[PDB]
Design a protein around this ligand. Structure first.
Ligand SMILES: Nc1ncnc2c1ncn2[C@@H]1O[C@H](COP(=O)(O)OP(=O)(O)O)[C@@H](O)[C@H]1O
Ligand SMILES: Nc1ncnc2c1ncn2[C@@H]1O[C@H](COP(=O)(O)OP(=O)(O)O)[C@@H](O)[C@H]1O
Ligand SMILES: [Mg+2]
Ligand SMILES: [Mg+2]
Ligand SMILES: [Mg+2]
Ligand SMILES: [Mg+2]
Lengths: 364, 105, 147, 77, 540, 96, 525
């Protein structure tokens, strides 16, 4: 890694001043987004100067007030040196992204990553009347294989979950439906048992179980749904073999084991409203999409892609590729740095020259 | 006569009178508590009315034991088995004395 | 004690009346059994197993002496010496199975509490030698000499 | 040990008297079997196989390895 | 002089008698007596500096490092981790004195130590220890008779509590809570007199709830004629103050009924489910309405309750308290004059307790709430609430107030008193010495040793107060002999006078008699032991 | 501490009575039985391994007895009388 | 003879005993060590400490609070334990004065050690100290001034007290801003003393001057999936119901049927029961529904279909604070909509703070509950900001409860010392020396305050003693320049309760420690 915050937090420092510097890096990463190394260098140099200041016989309280005065003056100087910017100027955004990426391993792939980062930021916010960017709306997916040149900016969502309905893929004009109930035998929250005292009852048990499952699948199919997402379930089996077979026979692509924390992102991306009871499963709660397909990444795994959505949400997903895991992690960190730079450009839209110019101007 | 230590009184024991001038003593080997009828007893009901009836039946069994003890004319009740808080308060309300887990000797 | 099933005994209560009457009926049954035993003239009961609390209470009510011989050998020897037969159930004994003895009492020898089944006649099926002594080893040696 | 504060053991009263009598009786019983015409000799192995067969009391008590002072008194006697 | 026996036979064969006799230890006769006397003297000399108003405290630390600062003799000796058996005997003697009396737990140890110290030189002079014990018993009988002679009676009437207050003040004078001397004396006297059967019967200490909370000041300690409960109102929006509350004590959780017997309720249809849910809702509404119908304003439960019942109680304007302990339930029922009701069906108006004010009390910036119930009509239970600057002084105040309560209880049991400050000990020593002169020669030594041992308490008091022991004790004894006044003691507080009757230094006669008796019996036991057989294994 | 106190030193054993006599007689009988078969014109020879690595193939009783080591003192006395017989007259060692 | 110095060994292995001089030595050493450690963190120019834990996590904590310093250390000296418990109890009673009371107790015990070295019985010292405590308490009470009647004067007093409390802490950099912050936050409580109604939210990043008091309220929870994220003219209902597969509370209930169709019917009945409960809630006419417990998927979907915000898993503190800030009633049954009060606020929206999203309540109805956002550069800075602000809020709440105030900067300590000295000049015996030592410690407190700033402490303290002698009863240490001045003019004010508690607790602990002449330790476990 080259990120200052990552370097500082990765190695145990064991010294209280160093731990406070690590916390400082974390704060700079949280608020600004980059500059996590420059802030630590500045703090270290300030304390190093404080050594000679103290040796001269200056109390470490006049030093603090003088440093506060210097900080105020320097903030004024930097503000005076800044230049206004607007989000409609794509060139400045591209320059900022390229400058952020210039010091990372993806400096060579910046020509692809910087426009990707700018588009990712601008596609999840409203350019007018925006004060901050929620980077949780930009999901980053790391898939091993290929090179960094294979990074892609799918507009919809990509799910690492595989299609249980082996045999049917690439549904066109998909009508995606997200359910939060279980497609298995009936079961109540309170304790329930079925007692059999006759062979006719024993046959009727599985007969009526089959009828109930078939009715559930028919109700799902009648709405016009053809792609089904099933939330992950622990207490009760989410998708039984009978339910999967019935869904397969009606040409529906079933995707199960959807994580609970991913529901909000999926609903925002597609427009599908979650359903928890089959009674309320209607056609208007389905998320229309242009194409939902499962693509294999040249033998390095399978990714499920849903590209094209009616009334698309304000979320984008970035697929990061690399030869080995380390470069993938560093590429993810660098892309995050670029996104953070664009975000902190969204608020306080002011630009300054880099290249050490602000520091030397402040010194003079 | 006989004297023995106080044996783990429950709540409401301090409300019982602690001196009687001609008490009739009820010597018992009985667990006066709300508990299962038997360790291998199971109750099976399918109606809320039967549920309420079962609860009232347990309470009425305990109260029948207590009332049978009370109507005997005894004022001091000693048992080799535990005497619950409900029974202790019942005896307190009647100005009676109770003591559970009295040693066999 | 009242005999129990051998597979599994579950008291299935379905109404409040059964719940209220179960304990009363069980106690009445045990009392009837003990009174039926006592009505045959028996005044001493020797059992080879555990003694129920209600059984003990009703035996006390009818003035019946209870002895609990845990070991089966002692039970057989008492049956031999008294003339009774070990009944397998709690049914009252018939005249031929009825046990008779001249005197049964609780006595203390030294500091040991003993129960004595004593015949006035100088006969019977089993005779006992009561060994006294000042040491356990001395009594053991005397017992070896007796053997 | 205690208020006397001497680095060693101490026996007082009937205990030490009994110990002295026991030591003297041990020495006596060592040689009691070698008295009179119906007495018998003794073998004394000297820890390396050397054998001394004797009936004389002085030789037996001199060759023995004694530690109790009240018994050394009898040996020297 | 140890290790049992070691002879290994005259014939050289092994001689083993006792199991593992080569590692055991034993002691015989006179040196065993000397070791016991030395251990008892060490314990007594350690304890004698905590005697009188000028006595100092001991900082006691347990295994876990928790620290307690105390002056109580029984507490000090209980906290000690001793190994000598005689030390354990001394600790048990202090525990006995605390159990029977509650005061004088330090005087008994000093008296026993002095008795054994005199017995040491008596034995060195060649006297059988049984003779010493018999002489000690005779002198103790004489001293107890003299104590009965010079005793004085006090009134234990509720109308005039001045002698009781003086006795409580004398008891508390040696504790750290003497900064609020008369206040603690008054609260202790009132607490004991409130909860007591006036026909010279017992005082049930379970009706006195002594509870302390940090913060505030020691002067903030007050007597509450009611109950202090660590709980608060269940709903945060329930009112914090109820006036003229009609208490409703219940031991049934505000939940749907549940049979004790193993039960199963079968739901076989949708109608069954609807009936079940309607039954639950109706049970909640019915229980709340049953509580309300009696006219109660407050509800006290023992086993807690759930959300629906909580909101129904709040909605119906019934403040409620849950998870109240059984002892607290009983105390509240006793104080408010209300019955304890096991289920809602039996609740009625006549079983409702009445309290003048029920309030929730805050304790600064601590978030910890606490409930107060007081202003009852004829409360037969009382609560003592102790405040302080740290938990150590709180515990010390707890035990000091317990000592005061025990002293007033002893006064109720028997109202005869004797005058303290060493006056009683000096008079008893004089009586013993006078009785010795008429006694035959051989027991005179034991009688005079007992008198000298009795003299230790005034000397200890004078030493703790900085005065010269021998001169002051001799002068006070001479004054007692010259003019007949058994009330002359050691002016520990330097008030100018030596008459303890004017200084109002009063102790219970039972306390002195118990001190002398217990010390004599324990000294007799210690003198009668002439053999010890410890395992001597020094095991881990 | 408190080391044991006793009359005789440690490692000092003592046995008495019929046991000692029986042991002495058994030791003498064992000594006799060692060379019982080396007597007469039809005696067999014995091979003895010297601790210094030598070999003594001999029929004489005295050499056999003096080349072996024993711990029982009665056996030592028997070996001594064998040597005495050998020195005094020259032969008759395995007969005595 | 003593237990330890006896020919017989009377103790278990590992247990010891310390007699008079040794016990006094250990107690005094521990007390002086505690006092020297806690001091130098006193007064406006005090410095902070670093508490580096030895545990596996090795928690790092920078602090200026005396109570936190004393509680988070390994103490083995029993007298040091007594002082630590004193500091903790002082913190519990009031939020300030922990360092002051600890230092005062240490100085008192140092003077006690000197007096014992001068051959004075400790009971005489204790009696003299009791008299001195009475005199000092009476003088301090007579010196108190109350301004609760006048609202503007009381506001000025609150500002001065908050500034004085925050002067010694890390917030002294922005003392003015943080003083306004704390005063407004306390005044919003409308007289209630529950500091738990004030929530302190620490968000990493930003300057320390970026901290602010939200005009409404902030919640750190999240909204459902298909529910509105912005509501105007909200009608909030606060509840504490199940909403998680709500089971009938009959423990022994079970389903025993002979067909799976009946099982499906029972499941539909359960879902219909949940739907009916949701409809009963919606009958209240609400916009935002806040439940203390979890809300599963079916009720969340039902709320979303009705366009009702549903905030879930707002803990007990959350629902209490929302009820305080909006005026709603925390309900658990919904059969009487007319008997349930509904909270109201102008706007509910999601606000972006740092890299986290929070729910913002704006234009609340009551507002008797505050949220304070703290921004900092390090976690330690945020922790100290929270601790210092807690101290300020505690002192302000105490002042609101009891409006009597005294002058700080050493003025109060010097006036009590003057009263004690005047009493001492009126008493014969060594008790006069004890009272003189009491006054000496009382004067040593502002001496340490002056030492912490590097000033000429001896000269300043002598000047203060003189000025109080001629009758200047408001003179104190002017820490801006290093002179003496009028604390009435300079506005250096303190709560009377805090100073009274400090004095009384210090005297109490010194008295209880001095009474000990023997320390006995059991064998450690
Ligand atoms: N004000 C006083 N003046 C003189 N002597 C007192 C005074 N108060 C208590 N004493 C004496 O101090 C002795 C010790 O009392 P204390 O320490 O309170 O309890 P204990 O008897 O358990 O030691 C008592 O025997 C009493 O006579
Ligand atoms: N501006 C100030 N000028 C003079 N003295 C002050 C000022 N602010 C605080 N002090 C004094 O500093 C003392 C210590 O306060 P502080 O260091 O905050 O810790 P604590 O309040 O816990 O003792 C207080 O007694 C107060 O009188
Ligand atoms: Mg950068
Ligand atoms: Mg006392
Ligand atoms: Mg030959
Ligand atoms: Mg402060």
């Amino acid at each position: 890694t080259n990120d200052g915050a990552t370097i500082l937090k990765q190695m145990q420092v064991l010294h209280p001043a160093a731990r406070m510097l690590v916390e400082l890096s974390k704060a700079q990463d949280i608020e600004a987004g980059d500059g996590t190394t420059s802030v630590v260098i500045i703090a270290g140099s300030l304390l190093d100067s404080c050594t000679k200041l103290l040796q001269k016989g200056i109390h470490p309280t006049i030093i603090s007030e003088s440093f506060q005065k210097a900080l105020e003056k320097g903030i004024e100087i930097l503000t005076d040196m800044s230049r206004p910017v607007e989000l409609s100027d794509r060139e400045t955004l591209l320059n900022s992204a390229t400058t952020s990426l210039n010091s990372k391993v993806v400096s060579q792939y910046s020509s692809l990553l910087s426009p990707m980062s700018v588009n990712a930021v601008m596609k999840v916010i409203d350019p007018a009347t925006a004060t901050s960017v929620d980077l949780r709306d930009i999901k980053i997916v790391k898939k091993l294989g290929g090179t960094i040149d294979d990074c892609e900016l799918v507009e919809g969502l990509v799910l690492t979950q595989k299609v249980s309905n082996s045999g049917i893929t690439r549904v066109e004009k998909a009508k995606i439906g997200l359910i939060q109930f279980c497609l298995s035998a009936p079961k109540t929250d309170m304790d329930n048992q079925i007692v059999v005292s006759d062979y006719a009852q024993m046959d009727r048990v599985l007969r009526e179980e089959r009828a109930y499952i078939l009715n559930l699948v028919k109700q799902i199919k009648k709405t016009g749904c053809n792609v089904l997402l099933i939330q992950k379930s622990i207490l009760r089996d989410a998708l039984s073999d009978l339910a999967l077979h019935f869904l397969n026979k009606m040409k529906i692509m079933v995707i199960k084991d959807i994580e609970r924390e991913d529901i909000e992102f999926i609903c925002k991306t597609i427009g599908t409203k979650p359903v928890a009871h089959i009674d309320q499963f209607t056609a208007d709660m389905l998320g229309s999409a242009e194409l939902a397909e499962e693509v294999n990444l040249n033998g390095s795994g399978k990714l499920l892609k849903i590209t094209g959505c009616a009334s698309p949400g304000k979320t984008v997903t970035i697929v990061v590729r690399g030869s080995n895991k380390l470069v993938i992690e560093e590429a993810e960190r660098s892309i995050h740095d670029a996104l953070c730079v664009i975000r902190c450009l969204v608020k306080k839209r002011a630009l300054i020259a880099g290249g050490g110019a602000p520091e030397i101007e402040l010194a003079l | 006569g006989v004297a023995f230590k106080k044996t783990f009184s429950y709540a409401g024991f301090e409300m019982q009178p602690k001196k009687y001038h001609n008490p009739k003593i009820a010597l018992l080997n009985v667990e006066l508590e709300l508990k299962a009828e038997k360790d291998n007893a199971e109750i099976r009901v399918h109606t809320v009315e039967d549920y309420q009836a079962i609860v009232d039946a347990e309470w009425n069994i305990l109260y029948d034991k207590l009332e049978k003890i009370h109507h005997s004319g005894a004022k001091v009740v000693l048992s080799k088995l535990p005497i619950g808080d409900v029974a202790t308060q019942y005896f307190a309300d009647r100005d009676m004395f109770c003591a559970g887990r009295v040693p066999e000797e | 004690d009242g005999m129990i099933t051998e597979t599994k005994g579950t008291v299935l209560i379905k109404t409040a009346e059964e719940l209220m009457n179960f304990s009363k009926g069980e106690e009445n049954l045990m009392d009837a059994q003990v009174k039926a035993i006592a009505d045959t003239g028996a005044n001493v009961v020797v059992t080879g197993g555990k003694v129920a609390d209600m059984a003990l209470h009703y035996a006390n009510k009818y003035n019946i002496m209870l002895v609990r011989l845990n070991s089966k050998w002692d039970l057989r020897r008492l049956c031999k010496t008294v003339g009774a037969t070990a009944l397998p159930r709690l049914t009252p004994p018939v005249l031929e199975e009825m046990g008779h003895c001249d005197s049964v009492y609780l006595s203390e020898v030294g500091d040991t509490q003993v129960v004595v089944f004593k015949h006035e006649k100088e006969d019977g099926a089993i005779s006992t030698i009561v060994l006294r002594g000042s040491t356990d080893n001395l009594m053991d040696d005397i017992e070896r000499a007796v053997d | 040990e205690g208020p006397l504060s001497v680095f060693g053991d101490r026996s007082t009263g009937e205990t030490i008297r009994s110990q002295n009598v026991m030591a003297a009786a041990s020495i006596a019983n060592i040689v009691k079997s070698s008295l009179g015409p119906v007495g018998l000799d003794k073998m004394l192995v000297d820890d390396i196989g050397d054998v001394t067969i004797t009936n004389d009391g002085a030789t037996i008590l001199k060759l023995l390895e004694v530690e109790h002072p009240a018994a050394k008194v009898l040996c020297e006697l | 002089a140890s290790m049992g026996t070691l002879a290994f036979d005259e014939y050289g064969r092994p001689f083993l008698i006792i199991k593992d006799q080569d590692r055991k230890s034993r002691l015989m006769g006179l040196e065993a007596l000397k070791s016991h006397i030395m251990a008892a003297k060490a314990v007594a000399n350690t304890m004698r500096t905590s005697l009188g108003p000028n006595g100092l405290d001991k900082m006691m630390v347990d295994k876990d490092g928790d620290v307690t600062v105390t002056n109580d003799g029984a507490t000090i000796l209980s906290m000690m981790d001793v190994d000598h058996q005689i030390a354990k005997l001394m600790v048990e003697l202090s525990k006995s004195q605390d159990d029977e009396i509650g005061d004088g737990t330090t005087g008994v140890v000093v008296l026993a130590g002095a008795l054994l110290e005199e017995a040491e030189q008596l034995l060195d002079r060649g006297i059988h220890p049984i003779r010493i014990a018999d002489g000690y018993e005779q002198a103790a009988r004489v001293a107890i008779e003299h104590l009965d002679k010079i005793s004085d009676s006090v009134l234990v009437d509720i109308k005039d509590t001045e002698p009781l207050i003086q006795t409580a003040k004398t008891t508390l004078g040696s504790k750290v809570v003497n900064s609020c001397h008369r206040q603690m004396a008054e609260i202790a006297v009132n607490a004991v007199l409130t909860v007591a059967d006036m026909e010279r019967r017992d005082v049930d200490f379970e009706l006195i709830k002594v509870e302390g909370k940090v913060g505030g000041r020691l002067e903030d300690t007050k007597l509450i004629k009611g109950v202090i409960v660590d709980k608060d109102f269940s709903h945060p929006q329930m009112p914090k103050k109820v006036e003229d509350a009609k208490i409703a004590i219940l031991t049934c959780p505000f939940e749907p009924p549940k049979p004790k017997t193993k039960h199963k309720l079968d739901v076989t249809s949708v109608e069954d489910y609807k009936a079940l849910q309607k039954y639950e809702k109706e049970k909640f509404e019915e229980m709340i309405q049953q509580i309300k119908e009696t006219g109660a304003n407050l509800a006290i439960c023992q086993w807690g309750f759930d959300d629906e019942a909580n909101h129904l109680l709040l909605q119906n304007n019934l403040p409620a308290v849950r998870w109240v302990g059984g002892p607290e339930i009983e105390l509240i029922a006793i104080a408010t004059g209300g019955r304890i009701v096991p289920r809602f069906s039996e609740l009625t108006a006549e079983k409702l307790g009445f309290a003048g004010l029920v309030q929730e009390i805050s304790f600064g910036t601590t978030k910890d709430k606490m409930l107060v119930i007081e202003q009852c009509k004829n409360s037969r239970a009382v609560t003592i609430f102790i405040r302080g600057g740290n938990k150590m002084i709180i515990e010390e105040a707890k035990r000091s107030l317990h000592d005061a309560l025990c002293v007033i209880r002893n006064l109720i049991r028997d109202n005869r008193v004797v005058y303290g400050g060493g006056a009683a000990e000096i008079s008893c020593a004089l009586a013993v010495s006078q009785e010795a002169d008429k006694c035959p020669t051989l027991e005179q030594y034991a009688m005079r040793a007992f008198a000298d041992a009795l003299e230790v308490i005034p000397m200890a008091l004078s030493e703790n107060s900085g005065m010269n022991p021998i001169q002051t004790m001799t002068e006070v004894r001479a004054r007692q002999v010259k003019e007949m006044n058994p009330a002359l003691g050691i002016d520990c507080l330097h008030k100018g006078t030596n008459d303890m009757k004017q200084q109002h230094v009063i102790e219970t006669l039972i306390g002195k008699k118990q001190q002398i008796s217990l010390a004599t019996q324990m000294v007799r036991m210690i003198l009668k032991i002439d053999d010890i057989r410890k395992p001597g294994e020094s095991e881990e | 501490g408190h080391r044991p106190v006793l009359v005789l030193s440690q490692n000092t054993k003592r046995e008495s009575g019929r046991k000692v006599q029986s042991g002495n007689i058994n030791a003498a009988k064992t000594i006799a039985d060692i060379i019982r078969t080396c007597l007469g014109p039809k005696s067999m020879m014995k091979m003895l391994l010297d601790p210094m690595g030598g070999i003594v193939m001999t029929n004489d009783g005295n050499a056999i007895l003096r080349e072996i080591q024993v711990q029982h003192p009665a056996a030592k006395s028997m070996i001594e009388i064998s040597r005495t017989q050998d020195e005094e007259v020259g032969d008759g060692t395995t007969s005595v | 003879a003593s237990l330890s110095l006896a020919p017989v060994n009377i103790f278990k292995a590992g247990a010891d005993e310390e007699r008079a001089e040794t016990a006094r030595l250990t107690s005094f050493i521990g007390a002086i060590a505690i006092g020297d450690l806690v001091k130098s963190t006193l007064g406006p120019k005090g410095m902070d400490k670093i508490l580096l834990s030895s545990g596996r996590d090795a928690s790092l904590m920078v602090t200026n609070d005396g109570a936190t310093i004393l509680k988070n250390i390994g103490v083995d000296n029993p007298a040091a334990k007594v002082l630590v418990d004193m500091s903790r109890v002082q913190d519990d009673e009031v939020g300030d004065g922990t360092t002051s009371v600890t230092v005062l107790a240490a100085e008192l015990l140092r003077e006690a050690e000197s007096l014992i070295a001068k051959k004075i019985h400790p009971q005489t010292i204790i009696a003299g100290w009791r008299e001195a405590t009475k005199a000092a308490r009476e003088a301090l009470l007579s010196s108190a001034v109350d301004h609760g009647s006048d609202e503007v004067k009381f506001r000025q007093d609150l500002m001065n007290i908050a500034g004085t409390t925050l002067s010694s802490k890390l917030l002294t950099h922005h003392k003015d801003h943080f003083t306004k912050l704390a005063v407004e936050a306390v005044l919003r409580l409308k007289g209630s003393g529950n500091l738990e109604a004030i929530h302190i939210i620490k968000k990493l990043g930003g300057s320390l001057a970026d901290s602010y008091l939200d005009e409404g309220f902030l919640l750190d929870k999240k909204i459902g999936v298909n529910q509105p994220k912005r509501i105007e003219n909200a009608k909030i209902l606060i509840a504490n119901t199940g909403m998680d597969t709500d089971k009938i509370k009959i423990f022994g209930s079970r389903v025993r049927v002979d067909s799976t169709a009946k099982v499906a019917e029972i499941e539909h009945a359960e879902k219909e029961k949940m739907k009916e409960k949701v409809e009963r809630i919606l009958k209240h006419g609400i916009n935002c529904f806040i439940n203390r417990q979890l809300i599963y998927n079916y009720p969340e979907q039902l709320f979303g279909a009705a366009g009702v915000m549903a905030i879930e898993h707002a803990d007990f503190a959350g629902v209490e604070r929302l009820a305080l800030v909006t005026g709603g009633e925390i309900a658990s049954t919904f059969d009487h909509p007319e008997l349930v009060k509904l909270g109201s606020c102008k706007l509910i929206e999601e606000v972006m703070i740092g890299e986290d999203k929070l729910i913002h309540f704006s234009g609340v109805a009551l507002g008797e509950a505050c949220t304070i956002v703290l921004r900092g550069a390090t976690q330690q800075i945020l922790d100290e900001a929270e601790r210092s602000l807690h101290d300020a809020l505690c002192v302000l709440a105490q002042t609101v409860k009891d409006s009597r105030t005294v002058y700080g900067g050493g003025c109060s300590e010097m006036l009590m010392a003057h009263a004690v000295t005047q009493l001492a000049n009126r008493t014969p015996g060594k008790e006069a020396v004890a009272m003189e030592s009491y006054a000496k410690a009382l004067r040593m407190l502002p001496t340490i305050i002056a030492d912490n700033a590097g000033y000429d402490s001896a000269d300043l303290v002598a000047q203060l003693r003189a000025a109080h002698s001629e009758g200047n009863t408001t003179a104190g240490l002017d820490m801006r320049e290093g002179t003496i001045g009028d604390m009435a003019i300079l506005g250096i004010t303190e709560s009377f309760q805090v100073k009274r508690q400090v004095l009384l607790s210090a005297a109490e602990a010194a008295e209880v420690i001095l009474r000990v002449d023997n320390i006995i330790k059991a064998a450690p476990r």
